Structure formats: structure tokens, C-alpha cells
Amino acid sequence: EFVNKSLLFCDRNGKSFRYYLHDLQVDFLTEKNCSQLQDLHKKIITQFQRYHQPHTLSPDQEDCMYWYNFLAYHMASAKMHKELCALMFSLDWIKAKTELVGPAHLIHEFVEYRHILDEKDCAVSENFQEFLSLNGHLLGRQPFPNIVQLGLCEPETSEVYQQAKLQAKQEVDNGMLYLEWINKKNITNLSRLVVRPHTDAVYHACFSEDGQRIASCGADKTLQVFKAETGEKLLEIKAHEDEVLCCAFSTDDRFIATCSVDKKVKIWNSMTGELVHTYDEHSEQVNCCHFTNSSHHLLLATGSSDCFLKLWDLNQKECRNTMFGHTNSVNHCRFSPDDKLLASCSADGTLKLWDATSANERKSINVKQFFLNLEDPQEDMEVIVKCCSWSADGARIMVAAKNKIFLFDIHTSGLL
Amino acid sequence: MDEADRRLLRRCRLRLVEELQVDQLWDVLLSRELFRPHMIEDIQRAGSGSRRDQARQLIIDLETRGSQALPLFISCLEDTGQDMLASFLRTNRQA
Amino acid sequence: GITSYVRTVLCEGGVPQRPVVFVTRKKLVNAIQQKLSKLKGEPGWVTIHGMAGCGKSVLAAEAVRDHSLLEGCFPGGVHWVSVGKQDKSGLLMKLQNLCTRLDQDESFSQRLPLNIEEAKDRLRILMLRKHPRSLLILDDVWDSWVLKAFDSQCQILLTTRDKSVTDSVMGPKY
Amino acid sequence: MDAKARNCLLQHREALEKDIKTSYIMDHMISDGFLTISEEEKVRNEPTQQQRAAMLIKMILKKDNDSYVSFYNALLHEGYKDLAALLHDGIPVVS
Amino acid sequence: MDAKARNCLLQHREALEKDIKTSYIMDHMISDGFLTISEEEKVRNEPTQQQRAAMLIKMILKKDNDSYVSFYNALLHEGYKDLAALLHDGI
Numbered sequence: 001e002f003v004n005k006s007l008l009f010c011d012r013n014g015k016s017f018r019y020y021l022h023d024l025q026v027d028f029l030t031e032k033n034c035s036q037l038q039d040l041h042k043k044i045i046t047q048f049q050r051y052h053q054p055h056t057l058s059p060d061q062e063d064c065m066y067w068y069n070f071l072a073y074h075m076a077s078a079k080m081h082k083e084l085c086a087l088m089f090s091l092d093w094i095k096a097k098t099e100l101v102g103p104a105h106l107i108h109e110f111v112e113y114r115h116i117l118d119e120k121d122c123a124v125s126e127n128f129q130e131f132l133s134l135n136g137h138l139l140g141r142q143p144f145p146n147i148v149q150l151g152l153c154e155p156e157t158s159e160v161y162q163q164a165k166l167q168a169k170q171e172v173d174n175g176m177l178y179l180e181w182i183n184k185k186n187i188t189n190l191s192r193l194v195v196r197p198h199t200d201a202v203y204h205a206c207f208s209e210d211g212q213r214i215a216s217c218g219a220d221k222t223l224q225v226f227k228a229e230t231g232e233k234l235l236e237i238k239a240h241e242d243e244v245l246c247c248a249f250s251t252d253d254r255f256i257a258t259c260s261v262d263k264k265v266k267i268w269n270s271m272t273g274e275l276v277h278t279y280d281e282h283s284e285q286v287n288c289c290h291f292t293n294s295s296h297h298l299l300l301a302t303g304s305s306d307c308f309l310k311l312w313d314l315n316q317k318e319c320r321n322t323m324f325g326h327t328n329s330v331n332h333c334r335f336s337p338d339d340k341l342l343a344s345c346s347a348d349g350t351l352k353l354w355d356a357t358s359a360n361e362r363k364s365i366n367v368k369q370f371f372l373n374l375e376d377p378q379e380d381m382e383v384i385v386k387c388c389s390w391s392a393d394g395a396r397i398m399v400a401a402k403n404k405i406f407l408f409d410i411h412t413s414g415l416l
Numbered sequence: 417m418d419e420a421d422r423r424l425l426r427r428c429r430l431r432l433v434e435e436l437q438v439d440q441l442w443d444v445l446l447s448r449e450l451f452r453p454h455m456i457e458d459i460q461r462a463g464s465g466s467r468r469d470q471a472r473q474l475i476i477d478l479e480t481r482g483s484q485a486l487p488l489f490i491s492c493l494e495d496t497g498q499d500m501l502a503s504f505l506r507t508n509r510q511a
Numbered sequence: 512g513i514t515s516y517v518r519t520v521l522c523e524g525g526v527p528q529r530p531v532v533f534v535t536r537k538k539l540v541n542a543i544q545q546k547l548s549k550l551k552g553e554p555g556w557v558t559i560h561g562m563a564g565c566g567k568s569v570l571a572a573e574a575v576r577d578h579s580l581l582e583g584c585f586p587g588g589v590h591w592v593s594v595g596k597q598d599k600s601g602l603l604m605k606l607q608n609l610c611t612r613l614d615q616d617e618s619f620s621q622r623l624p625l626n627i628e629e630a631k632d633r634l635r636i637l638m639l640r641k642h643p644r645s646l647l648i649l650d651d652v653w654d655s656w657v658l659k660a661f662d663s664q665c666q667i668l669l670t671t672r673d674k675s676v677t678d679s680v681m682g683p684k685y
Numbered sequence: 686m687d688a689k690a691r692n693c694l695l696q697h698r699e700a701l702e703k704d705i706k707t708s709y710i711m712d713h714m715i716s717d718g719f720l721t722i723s724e725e726e727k728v729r730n731e732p733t734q735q736q737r738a739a740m741l742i743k744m745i746l747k748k749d750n751d752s753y754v755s756f757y758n759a760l761l762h763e764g765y766k767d768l769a770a771l772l773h774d775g776i777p778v779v780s
Numbered sequence: 781m782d783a784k785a786r787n788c789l790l791q792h793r794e795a796l797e798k799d800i801k802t803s804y805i806m807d808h809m810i811s812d813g814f815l816t817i818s819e820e821e822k823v824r825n826e827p828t829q830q831q832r833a834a835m836l837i838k839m840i841l842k843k844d845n846d847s848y849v850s851f852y853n854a855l856l857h858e859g860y861k862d863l864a865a866l867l868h869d870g871i
């Protein structure tokens with residue numbers, strides 16, 4: 001009857017029905033029902049208590065997935081913090097939630113969680129987040145290793161530590177042959193976070209220009225895009241033809257170029273995730289892809305094993321300028337802060353500051369600066385620069401090769 | 417095809433299916449673009465494939481082939497030496 | 512491209528002119544119009560609905576705005592009625608007003624019906640003879656008896672918020 | 686499809702329903718990518734030639750400019766000269 | 781009659797009244813069965829041909845579509861080519 005009143009949209013997905021609202025419809029509700037809303041939420045939780053307990057929740061039941069995520073949500077509005085402790089804290093609840101949800105939603109909930117409860121607990125939340133840092137890397141796989149055993153590794157004490165020792169003691173009398181560890185305070189400089197996006201070897205990753213999110217590819221050649229903070233899946237990409245070689249965000253993070261062995265330069269949208277741009281020109285596999293650092297000009301410089309640069313015009317299907325120059329396969333590629341310029345690197349090691357505006361050569365520093373008078377029959381050493389590092393202004397090019405980093409000044413075409 | 421022509425084809429059903437020679441008629445029908453070649457293969461296979469079954473399907477399908485299908489069909493009759501049948505038809509159209 | 516003539520028919524109909532600041536919704540207009548085309552003859556009702564302020568009226572005005580569908584299809588003029596929301600008494604007046612509007616000649620009795628059904632008769636008869644191919648458009652509509660009243664057996668299309676409204680009515684509904 | 690095209694179909698619907706032998710049209714339209722198999726099965730399920738034609742037109746009235754053209758072309762290509770002529774002035778600009 | 785028909789008449793009813801002679805046109809419409817004898821006498825009884833034309837047109841306006849075509853054919857058949865041209869728009 002509501003749907004007919006056009007106050008709640010229908011969803012005929014299979015037998016199941018999901019009803020939902022417009023953003024405007026929802027906003028009106030809070031506008032006109034806000035005082036009640038804080039009151040009611042308590043109403044929903046108690047009813048759920050009259051039915052399934054959170055431990056009494058099951059995988060088969062249709063509602064449950066809503067239940068963990070919005071179960072967590074409702075209690076917050078309820079403003080009941082002790083009840084919130086009754087739910088979110090429960091490590092087993094974390095176990096089941098991890099089991100089908102994954103270890104990102106809980107982290108996102110925790111940030112919301114911190115304001116809701118107490119500052120002192122916040123530390124407990126800090127201890128738990130620290131307990132999660134070890135979770136991301138191997139936890140998801142499958143053999144959900146008996147956490148109760150892998151848990152007794154944290155330092156200090158925290159709510160987690162205290163919980164773990166008691167659990168272990170309970171396990172121990174029965175059996176389970178848990179082995180105590182006595183050196184933790186003496187060992188491990190913990191990293192703040194770990195991510196496994198792919199079962200298949202990673203090949204490249206890049207920050208969003210905003211820094212809000214990161215995309216990594218892999219040997220499988222699927223690319224996964226994620227927001228690092230809450231550390232929760234924010235993008236799934238079905239496939240890339242061939243094995244991914246490298247990928248990169250657009251300067252406004254509105255696009256994602258994807259290099260590959262196939263030679264399918266698939267510039268998928270960064271939001272919808274649907275493909276937008278696409279390119280090919282290289283005689284060989286692409287070495288690197290990058291969007292123009294300038295907000296204005298839209299270009300796609302691309303090195304490859306054929307040694308030729310390809311300066312794509314992103315506004316056009318065909319390349320703005322093929323650029324032979326490197327005597328060896330390109331090692332890396334980046335746009336200069338001056339979009340008129342386009343630096344490039346390769347195994348010959350010499351920098352090449354191309355003039356993109358003229359579609360012609362402008363400058364190219366030689367790199368024999370790694371002088372080394374060995375007994376080697378070869379003459380002056382043939383430097384092989386890899387990374388094409390930039391100064392924060394990008395006015396000069398930092399590089400590194402063999403045994404030495406260098407900071408060349410391309411504008412003056414000389415070493416510094 | 418107007419209703420009067422259609423009605424004529426129904427009224428003459430018995431005579432058409434009894435007397436129509438089809439094997440010799442296909443070329444004529446093609447020449448006057450009354451049927452496409454595949455349409456002809458389909459008509460040829462109608463029912464048991466006998467002359468009568470082909471004839472019947474021909475004259476039924478004829479009703480769909482245009483405003484001038486009937487006079488064009490009489491002409492094809494004439495062109496293939498089926499003057500008697502064409503004559504029976506014409507003297508009705510006029511009648 | 513509005514024909515000059517289209518505006519002349521439309522003025523008589525009384526549909527509002529589209530707001531100066533508008534933006535066609537070609538796909539939607541096309542769908543209504545093609546569908547609207549569908550009841551080539553014989554009664555029929557079309558319902559259009561959305562959450563409040565979805566362009567529901569403007570589309571109705573826009574769909575008929577075009578010459579092709581209207582001119583070949585609809586020898587009868589188009590009449591628009593703004594139903595709104597009504598108590599039984601209020602509804603009654605709209606009917607008389609539609610009576611006065613439709614009967615420009617005045618050949619029919621100057622006296623107006625005091626009974627809803629009698630107005631229904633004047634509408635049906637007027638639609639049947641006076642305006643043979645006419646299409647009636649309604650605005651809003653919030654309860655069934657209302658369409659019960661307008662249920663003249665002659666095509667009327669109601670545009671609204673509830674889609675429940677056209678359940679009392681009989682005949683093909685899209 | 687454009688209102689011009691659709692109204693042209695509506696105007697001539699009866700002529701079209703009387704004459705169209707759908708088996709010679711649906712194939713072209715499927716090849717062209719503007720008629721689906723399930724629509725074709727729905728058509729096939731009608732017991733008589735005119736009922737099938739009626740169903741097919743029902744379906745086409747809801748389709749786009751390209752579809753109308755697909756339909757028109759198939760009509761022309763299959764020798765329905767008179768029927769195509771009826772639909773000629775209603776052809777919409779495409780691509 | 782149709783909206784465009786009725787309006788085409790109204791749009792040109794003045795040029796019509798200022799030129800057309802009703803008797804021949806009424807002979808046609810009577811034969812076609814789109815005008816009655818009584819209607820014909822009411823028109824004929826008018827003091828001036830402009831009023832007769834005006835009365836005829838007044839009557840045709842409340843008539844069916846076929847009467848619009850009967851009046852149009854009559855005009856053509858009677859030599860009122862330009863006025864029939866103006867009404868071609870109407871149906």
C-alpha cells in the first residue's frame with residue numbers, strides 16, 4: 001500500500017523484497033520525525049532481543065547480514081553504551097562478522113564507535129585496532145587460524161590482552177596444547193596496517209590524488225581499488241586482458257589507466273568503475289602509464305619495451321605524439337609539473353626532458369655521473385636509472401641507479 | 417488485397433485447388449514479383465507437397481501479396497497457358 | 512517544433528504552457544506518447560506516478576505538446592481538468608465547470624445538474640457526440656470515487672501520486 | 686520511436702496485420718539485432734497468421750527508431766511493396 | 781468535428797463569407813446528405829449572401845467530419861479553388 005502511495009520503492013529481486021527510499025524521502029523523515037527516532041531505535045533492539053540473540057544469529061537467515069551492520073548501527077542511536085559493549089566488543093561476534101563480512105566493516109564501525117562510548121574504552125578500541133593490524137594480512141584466507149591462540153601476542157594488556165589470557169586458560173584445562181610466547185616485548189616493530197587485496201602476486205599500486213584511496217593490481221590481472229583508512233573493499237574490477245603491468249589514477253581521481261601485456265590501455269572510470277577511455281599503439285608491452293599532472297591538459301605518456309614513448313592525447317582516440325628517443329626500453333614514466341615538458345627514463349639511464357608542446361626533443365641529460373674506475377673491460381659505466389623521482393616542486397629530477405642516487409637539474413641540463 | 421478480391425479467391429477455392437498447375441507457374445510469379453523465392457520453397461512444401469496442397473497454400477498466401485495480387489496472378493495464369501482458369505477468375509472479378 | 516495550430520488546439524484545451532526553464536525528457540515523453548498512442552480507440556485509462564515533484568505534470572503537458580501523436584491520432588481536442596483533492600461537495604463543482612467548458616454552443620440545457628451521475632451523463636454524451644475523439648487529462652487525484660465520477664467510458668488519463676487510485680475503474684489500464 | 690513513426694504504424698496497423706507473414710520478417714529483425722528470441726517465441730505462439738502479425742506490431746510499436754527501419758527494410762526486402770509504401774513517410778531519422 | 785477541422789473553418793470563415801454563394805454548395809451538401817431542407821431554407825432565408833454563408837458555416841461547424849469534406853469538395857467543384865486551398869489544412 002505504501003509503494004502505491006509512492007512513499008517507498010519496491011524491489012522485486014527474486015522472492016526477496018528490499019524496500020528503500022529516495023535521499024529526499026529519508027531526509028524529510030528526519031526533518032519531521034527526529035525526536036522520535038532516538039527513542040524508537042531502542043524499540044527495535046529490544047524486539048530483536050525478544051527474538052534472536054547476536055550469538056543466536058545464523059548464516060542461513062536472510063535478515064542477519066543487515067543485522068550485524070545495522071545491528072551495530074541501531075545501538076548507537078539508542079545511545080546505550082553498555083549494550084553497545086554487550087554487542088560490538090564480543091570477540092566471537094567479531095569472528096562471525098569477519099567470517100562473511102570481512103575485516104573492513106568492523107574497522108569502519110569502530111571509528112563511529114569511539115565517539116559513542118568512552119575515552120577510556122577508546123584505548124580498548126585502540127588496542128583492538130592494534131589487534132586488527134595483524135588481522136588483515138592472513139586472516140581472511142580460509143583456515144581462520146584459531147585466533148584465540150594467535151591473539152596472545154599483543155603487548156601491554158588492553159581489553160584484548162586481558163580477554164585473551166583468560167580464554168587461553170579456559171581452553172588449556174580441556175586441552176588444545178596452546179604454546180605460550182615469552183618474548184613479545186623484546187620483539188616485533190609493528191606496522192600500522194597490512195592489506196592483501198589479491199591471492200595472486202601484486203604488480204603495481206597507486207594512491208588517489210586526494211589520498212583517500214589506493215588501487216593495486218596483480219599477476220591475476222584483476223585490479224582492486226580500496227579506501228585505506230577503514231580498510232574496506234570499495235571497488236572490485238572483473239578482469240584486465242593479459243597480466244596487469246601498472247595502473248594509475250587521474251589527477252582528479254576521475255579515471256584509472258591500466259597498463260597491460262595485451263596492449264589494452266583500459267582507462268576505466270574511477271567512480272562508476274565502467275570503462276571510459278582506451279588506447280593502443282605500442283609495438284611491445286607497455287612499461288608505464290600516467291595521467292597528466294596538469295588539471296587542464298589531458299595526456300597519456302606511456303613507455304614500453306619497444307623503447308618508443310607514446311604521448312597520447314586523452315581527448316583523442318589516436319596518439320598526440322609518438323616519441324622515439326630512448327636507446328633502451330623505458331624504465332619509468334611521469335608527467336612534469338610543467339605539462340609543456342615531459343620527462344622520461346630508460347635503461348640507458350639518461351634522463352629525457354621532452355618538449356611535449358612542440359612534440360619534439362628539448363633536453364636530455366646524460367648519466368655517466370656514476371663514475372667508477374674498475375678493472376672492468378667496459379669503459380665508463382652504463383648507468384641504468386630506475387625510479388624517476390621528482391622534487392616536490394618537480395623543477396628537478398631525483399633518480400637512483402646502481403650504487404648511487406642522483407639529483408639532476410634538467411632545466412639546466414646538469415648534475416647537482 | 418481488397419475484400420472483393422479476397423472473397424473471389426475464397427469463392428473459387430474448389431476450382432483453383434482442383435485445376436491449378438503450379439510447377440509451371442513459379443517463373444511467372446517471380447517475374448511479376450508476387451513471391452520471394454523462399455516463399456515459393458515454403459509453398460512447395462505445404463502439407464503433403466501434392467499439387468493440390470501447394471495450390472491451396474499458394475492461393476491463401478496470395479491474399480497477402482498486395483493490392484494488385486489478384487490481377488497479377490490472373491496474368492501469370494495467362495502466361496503459363498492456364499487460360500481456362502484465368503478466364504473463370506476474370507469473369508468473376510468483372511461479375 | 513510546435514506547430515502554430517498545435518498551440519491553437521492546446522489553448523482551447525487549457526493545458527498550462529510549459530515553464531520557460533524546462534528540459535525535455537525525450538525517452539520518457541516518447542514512451543508515454545507511444546503508449547498513449549496505444550488505445551487508438553475504445554475507452555482506456557493511463558496512470559503516471561512518482562514521489563512528489565518528479566516532473567509528473569510537465570510530462571503530461573509535454574507529451575501532448577507534440578503535433579504527430581496528437582494530430583493524426585486525436586481529431587478530438589484535448590481537455591485538461593485540475594482535480595486536486597476534494598470533499599464530495601467540492602468535486603461536484605468541477606464537474607459542472609467541465610460541463611460549461613465542454614458545451615461552448617450551449618445547445619444543451621443551461622441548467623446544471625445537481626447530481627454527480629447526471630454530470631457523468633452530460634460528459635459521456637458530450638464526449639460521445641460533441642467531441643468524438645477527445646482525450647481528458649487529470650491532475651493529481653487522491654481517491655477512487657473521484658475517478659468513479661469521471662468514469663465516462665471515454666479515455667481519460669489521470670496523473671498522480673497513488674497508483675492505487677485507478678482500481679475502481681474498468682477497461683484497459685497502463 | 687519518434688511520434689511520427691509510431692503514428693504511421695498506428696494508422697496502417699490493420700493493413701499490416703492482414704498481410705504480414707511474420708516468419709519472413711522476424712528473421713531479418715533478429716539478424717539486425719532489433720527483435721529478441723523471446724519476442725519471436727511470443728509471436729510464434731499465436732495460432733493464426735494475422736494474430737502473429739498483430740502481436741509483432743504490438744511489440745514493434747514500443748521499439749526505437751532503428752527498429753522501425755529494420756521492420757520497414759524487411760518489408761521492402763520481402764516484396765511487400767504496398768505495405769512499405771504505407772510506412773515510407775513515417776521513417777525516422779537514424780544514427 | 782475534429783479540432784483542426786473546426787478551427788480551420790473559424791480561421792477562414794470570414795474570407796469564405798465574403799466570397800461564396802450558398803445555393804450551389806447546398807445542392808451538393810443536400811445530395812451528399814450532409815445538409816437538410818430546413819437547414820437549407822434557414823440559410824436561404826437570410827437577407828444577404830454574407831449572412832447565408834455565415835449561417836451555412838455556422839451550421840457546418842456543429843457537424844461531423846464528413847460535412848467538412850462535403851463542404852470542401854463543393855467549394856472545389858464550384859470554382860472556389862483558393863478557399864478550398866485554405867481549408868486543405870483542416871482535414
Ligand SMILES: Nc1ncnc2c1ncn2[C@H]1C[C@H](O)[C@@H](COP(=O)(O)OP(=O)(O)OP(=O)(O)O)O1
Pocket residue numbers: 530532533534535562563564565566567568569570651671672
Ligand atoms: N523540463 C522539466 N521537466 C520537469 N520538471 C521541470 C522541468 N523544468 C523545471 N521543472 C520543475 C519546475 C516545476 O515546479 C516542476 C514540474 O512540476 P510537476 O513535475 O508537474 O510536479 P507534479 O505536478 O507531479 O507534483 P504533484 O505530485 O504535487 O502534483 O519541476
Ligand SMILES: [Mg+2]
Pocket residue numbers: 567568650651
Ligand atoms: Mg500535478
